Amino acid sequence: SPTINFINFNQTGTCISLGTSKGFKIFNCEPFGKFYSEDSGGYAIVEMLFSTSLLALVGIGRLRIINTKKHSIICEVTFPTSILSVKMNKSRLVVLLQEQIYIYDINTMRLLHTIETNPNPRGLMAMSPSVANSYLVYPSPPKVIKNGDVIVFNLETLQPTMVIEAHKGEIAAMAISFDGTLMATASDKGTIIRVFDIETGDKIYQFRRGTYATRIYSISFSEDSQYLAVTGSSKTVHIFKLGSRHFASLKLPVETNSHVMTISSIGSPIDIDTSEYPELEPVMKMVPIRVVSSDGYLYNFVMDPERGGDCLILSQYSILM
């Protein structure tokens, strides 16, 4: 049975990306189905555009970009050190190494600017997916107090904008709103979650997670920037309303192994019936929540945006089959 090394949604939450030890696979969420998969070789990093049949492909052990609808190679470039993580927009290319970060235009593929960054073995970044507010942020720890410094960078103008004293320690997890107005960061202790307004840098929401310090894997904003989701080694997913303590609680089933990396995302609100699902009026709106885990399973949840609390489990598909 194949193992899996990477999980990430698209920029909208309508697809599933994966690179396996024997290939890669891409999926869709609402009308569950299989688009594409190749059993070529091992891989490390996979990312997508807003669909458009373009893939970011990295070998497990260079960057290769492939058009799946064309089954052909668009371009290919080499880097000195091992690649760690990238994300995509409609106007720029962003790639990071442990001490270097590179930026390119998506269309013409030519290089634009190079920034020599401090060591980031974890390699956590955050970049807007919108053109008119294209902003990218990376941590700036001092070269071994002021440990939690982040740099606010504009891909349209290729210049730094502002510096924020976000956290007291090393940076752990970052995400940026769909419209690029908000950015949230995670400390190593994971007790304090802070999200800011990008243009002014003023802190707007300060959040408390859990009781004892646990690591934080990743976080993700919603399309309307109303809710934020957190994933950690406590196998528990907490959401925080952006409209303190956690608003509502997500609990993965017991049979799931604890040492799992899990990625979550938030979609547009939906209306569902109360008849088929014993939630405990025919229709009242529900917010869908999707969580895909590195153990190889998908889960569907529904969110009550007044009551909060535990969310009921609806259905679970099993990936790789």
Residue numbers in the entry: 5 to 65, 74 to 156, 222 to 320, 409 to 445, 459 to 499
Q: What do the paper's sentences say?
A:
Autophagy-related protein 18 (Atg18) participates in the elongation of early autophagosomal structures in concert with Atg2 and Atg9 complexes. Atg18 belongs to the protein family of β-propellers that bind polyphosphoinositides (PROPPIN). The corresponding primary structure contains a series of conserved WD40 repeats forming the 6 or 7 blades of a β-propeller fold. The autophagic membrane adapter Atg18 reveals an unexpected structural plasticity in multiple modes of oligomeric organization.
Using these preparations in high-salt buffer, we determined the single-particle cryo-EM structure of soluble Atg18-WT fractions. Due to the very small particle size, i.e., the Atg18 monomer corresponds to 55 kDa, we imaged over 1000 particles on a single cryo-micrograph. Classification analysis revealed separate views of single Atg18 displaying characteristic structural features of blade separation of the β-propeller. Alongside Atg18 monomer particles, we were also able to classify a selection of Atg18 dimers. Comparison with projections of the T and I-interface dimers extracted from atomic model of the Atg18 tube matched some of the 2D classes. Moreover, we failed to reconstruct coherent dimer 3D structures of these Atg18 dimers presumably due to higher flexibility in solution than observed in the helical assembly. Nevertheless, using monomeric class members we determined the 3D structure of Atg18-WT at 4.8 Å resolution according to the FSC 0.143 criterion. Next, we successfully docked a single refined atomic model taken from the helically assembled Atg18 into the density of monomeric Atg18-WT. In accordance with the helical assembly structure, three major loop regions were not resolved and disordered in monomeric Atg18. Together, the structure determination of soluble Atg18 supports the occurrence of monomers and dimers in agreement with the T and I-interfaces observed in the helically assembled lattice structures.
